[PDB]
Symmetry: D2
Subunit: 255 residues, 4 copies
């Protein structure tokens, strides 16, 4: 991997522990130009300060709430006007109400169900549709998933079903965008301490189970997701699409 | 043999609905049945189809699964009229026609969330309400399609909604397992129904199964029903979180 | 109901064999049954077990599946004595105890190939011979474990033999489908059996299912039998190449 | 960058070997390579092809993986000549021609076990011997095919051997994980190689990939090499027991 002359859009950095920030450090070290999108004001503040550890000469920052069609549309439109054509997009975005990340899955409200679907799954579809305008001769889109999309897992609840959805959204976008030379793939990350993880029931007892039971007998970090992201986002992976690569110490393969 | 059993079948529109295949089999096997519908026309078709069944009473409730109120009051009224039930057959899905053909990447937010709402979320709330009527346990089965497991031409928004449904099944199985309520899926191969008439390329697929699947023939609604009868009965007492493919073997080949 | 159906059950050792849970269930449903066993310390023993069943007469045949001759002549004799059959329950596996614990990287070539031979290949030759007695179609079922789909501690060489078995089921299903012979697997949860004693860490696993599987309990031989009856009968007519987990929901969680 | 890395590549026969795609990519990235072969002809081809490589010296070892002693001694020799290694690329399978066409249920014992021994078991014993040369960890990658996961036409005995390999991969992963050795598979799409010339319907499968696979084209050996570089380097730290489909997306559609 050498990524000079490539440009990637990274969605979903909130702070220095975001998985997406591990992705940014890996592409930035490999020479990529990076463009960042955020929702909260605070996230933009964290980004402005995090850019200082990065080799990026210019901060390219865009507020995109992927709940709004408008913002996703105008956002990628503006990126294209500012930095020209891009080579792919790292998607690191999900959301559920607290209520819905513990207790009984059977008590999920309609509203918290669809909210999780909207932000964590649907958002990839609209991003794919808008980013593709910026990839007239091909590129790579990567989303972040979790083993809870493949098995029923304690507490993950409404997000499990949103990840199952995301993982199919990836396969369907791969089939659709493939003839355009646009590849689409998931990374299934193992548990990592991030802002978002602090809201998931039983996160610590899962962290520890990995260490004890996963083939590598250790947890992964954001940089390790970064390294697999670079592979997927680069020509090193040009034969690979509709795939989900587990970066989880091997925990997916055992029972 | 399901005498003294009571099942709620959701989703008969007409004589060709998969759920009517379920109904015939369970009726033949001695079960009391209760039916739920959305459209006026479906109650009409239902009243007529009961004349072919051995149900001596018509138990028909209008439940639109987009309304919590209707699901809640629906099942509550079922509880008052027939008492405790032994399982629920979920046979409900919907997507707008334009989201069943062409390019998936062009799917609207509203299109996507409508598919999810009716074809996946509806299972969670139905399970929640139906639970109240199974103090001793019971069985819930949903209807899915292989496009939930793989990207399949045209199926589009519905394939993402089935992937959600199939997951919804695993999560409900885990949640409701301690209450002795099994939750499973049947993944039916393609069958000519009213809804099937709205999916691009249905006919192509139907004939490819016939040519390519291990059994070299398509399945029908009665074969779905017979697998439902297994899953809804004590025959399948140790099975939950499972997706049985009733699809002539198509799922095992490539 | 299975009156006027005939099944070959392969792999009874003692009162605890999964195969015998299958037999009680098929016998209770009125099938005629034929039994195969490996050596004599099942023969005197099998004759005592059958007193429990309602088989009016014992049809018992020595087949060690390591020998083609015994598989071929065994099935030939069956056809001469009992006529055409409706299906086979395959309940047979073997590995050396030393390969069922410790480090999988340390498995011998001989131990690896023995587990393959007896645990997987045998289904292929049994299916070839059985087909001869199923001119109008039929049903073949093998017994597998979740350790064919995931790396699981200790199971080691048998895990790779089951992955092999589970593919064997898919390939047999495609091959024999046009002859209307369905081939499936049941993935049984842990059950206390003669063979289970030689598997490292078995009790640890059994206790864990009870703590963690959706149903919070273990399954038994009879629950395997009930799903076997489904798979062996016309109730499953549209299902082939399938692997049903009878395991309290354990496969669906992580 | 792979300077200061050494990888053993097993199974180049000629310029079209998948393993030679791997070697052109590793050699390009700075690695030192050691090659293993069976036939004298493969050695001849290896000496010819090394003129296209940056490798300053040839490191060729004859290892027929049917022999324990050749594997044990070959790797032992490799350690003595190059010292500790960073990884192995495994690109070895074999079945008799008669088992790559026609009816799977007609496979002989000897042909089934031959394919197992060469195509699956060999990875186990190669892992055990190579582990002696990886005290600080490393990476082992085997080459599989979609046919290990689904019943595919003609592939027959080798599909069951691939199921076996893919499980062999998971079990090696769990086993060698604590030693910091990662074990993974690449599922390559179909590519014109010497051994592909012996597989039934190989041409029609190639063309179907172009017509149906998401990228509407076939892959080549170098694309496998690229993914191999990733699996073999620190880029994939974290990844083990994984199967990456380098196949234009074909695994994910139906
Ligand atoms: N950490 C883990 O254990 C784990 C494991 C597997 C997969 N994942 C996945 O990894 C991804 C990244 O999450 P993380 O763990 O890195 O946590 P995180 O740092 O909290 O990142 C979550 C990001 O989602 C963004 N987001 C949520 N709603 C949004 C919206 N409506 N519009 C735009 N952005 C929105 C947030 O931005 P704002 O702060 O601006 O709202 C935030 O940047 C998620 O998909 C997650 O599900 C996490
Ligand atoms: N045919 C196939 O090839 C196939 C294959 C695999 C799985 N399936 C699945 O099998 C199930 C049954 O469909 P089908 O093919 O039998 O077609 P169908 O006869 O058209 O039945 C579909 C049913 O869905 C109901 N429905 C849709 N929206 C609803 C709502 N908001 N509230 C309550 N009911 C609603 C319809 O009721 P109303 O008419 O009253 O609106 C109708 O009874 C679906 O889940 C479908 O996805 C079908
Ligand atoms: N017990 C469990 O928790 C569990 C779970 C899932 C799957 N399974 C599977 O269930 C099946 C039945 O095993 P089980 O647990 O019921 O134990 P079992 O009672 O000991 O049955 C295994 C049977 O295989 C027979 N067998 C071994 N090698 C043979 C050969 N070369 N030729 C003919 N027969 C041979 C044994 O016969 P002999 O008495 O003559 O040696 C015995 O009858 C096996 O496939 C096993 O892998 C078991
Ligand atoms: N080509 C494809 O479409 C495709 C697709 C998916 C996976 N694969 C897999 O890729 C791998 C490489 O195959 P290929 O297509 O590149 O064909 P290939 O060039 O013909 O290579 C096959 C290799 O296997 C070696 N081999 C067979 N038996 C052996 C033994 N007993 N000991 C040592 N080596 C032995 C051969 O060595 P000798 O010539 O010296 O005997 C040869 O180098 C295989 O695992 C194959 O199953 C291929
Ligand atoms: C169930 C315990 C492990 C969960 C791992 C994990 C942690 C953070 C995750 O990110 C989330 C973002 C929004 C809502 C919920 C989660 C995640 O997806 C997955
Ligand atoms: C992709 C072609 C095969 C489609 C098979 C099939 C047919 C009908 C189906 O039922 C519905 C489809 C769309 C909306 C509502 C219900 C189905 O789920 C699956
Ligand atoms: C891994 C611990 C759970 C074992 C469950 C289990 C028990 C018995 C089993 O049957 C065997 C038959 C012969 C040799 C070895 C095993 C099995 O397959 C699976
Ligand atoms: C089924 C048609 C596609 C075959 C793809 C393919 C081609 C070559 C392959 O390599 C083989 C090596 C030895 C025996 C058999 C095959 C392969 O595994 C897979
Ligand atoms: N399960 C606790 C969290 C405790 C933990 O992290 O282990 C909760 O409901 O948040
Ligand atoms: N099916 C032929 C190969 C010719 C083709 O694929 O057209 C065979 O027996 O090898």
């Amino acid at each position: 991997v050498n990524l000079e002359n490539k440009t990637y859009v990274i969605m979903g950095i909130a702070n220095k522990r975001s998985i997406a920030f591990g992705v940014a450090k890996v592409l930035d070290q490999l020479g990529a130009k990076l463009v960042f999108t955020y929702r909260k004001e605070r996230s933009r503040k964290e980004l402005e300060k995090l850019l200082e550890q990065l080799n990026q000469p210019e901060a390219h920052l865009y507020q995109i709430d992927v709940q709004s069609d408008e913002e996703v549309i105008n956002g990628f439109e503006q990126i294209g006007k500012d930095v020209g054509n891009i080579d792919g997009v790292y998607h690191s975005i999900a959301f559920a109400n607290m209520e819905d990340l513990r207790g009984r899955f059977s008590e999920t409200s309609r509203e918290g169900f669809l909210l999780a679907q909207d932000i964590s799954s649907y958002s990839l579809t609209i991003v794919a549709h808008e980013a593709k305008k910026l990839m007239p001769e091909g590129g790579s889109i990567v989303a972040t998933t979790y083993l809870g999309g493949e098995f029923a897992v304690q507490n993950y609840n409404v997000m499990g079903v949103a990840k199952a959805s995301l993982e199919a959204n990836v396969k369907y976008l791969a089939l659709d965008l493939g003839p355009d030379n646009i590849r689409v793939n998931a990374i299934s990350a193992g548990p990592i301490r991030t802002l978002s993880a602090k809201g998931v029931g039983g996160f610590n007892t899962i962290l520890k189970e990995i260490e004890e039971r996963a083939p590598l007998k250790r947890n992964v970090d954001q940089v390790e997701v970064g390294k697999t992201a670079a592979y997927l986002l680069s020509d090193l992976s040009s034969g690979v699409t509709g795939e989900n690569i587990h970066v989880d110490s091997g925990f997916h393969a055992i029972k």
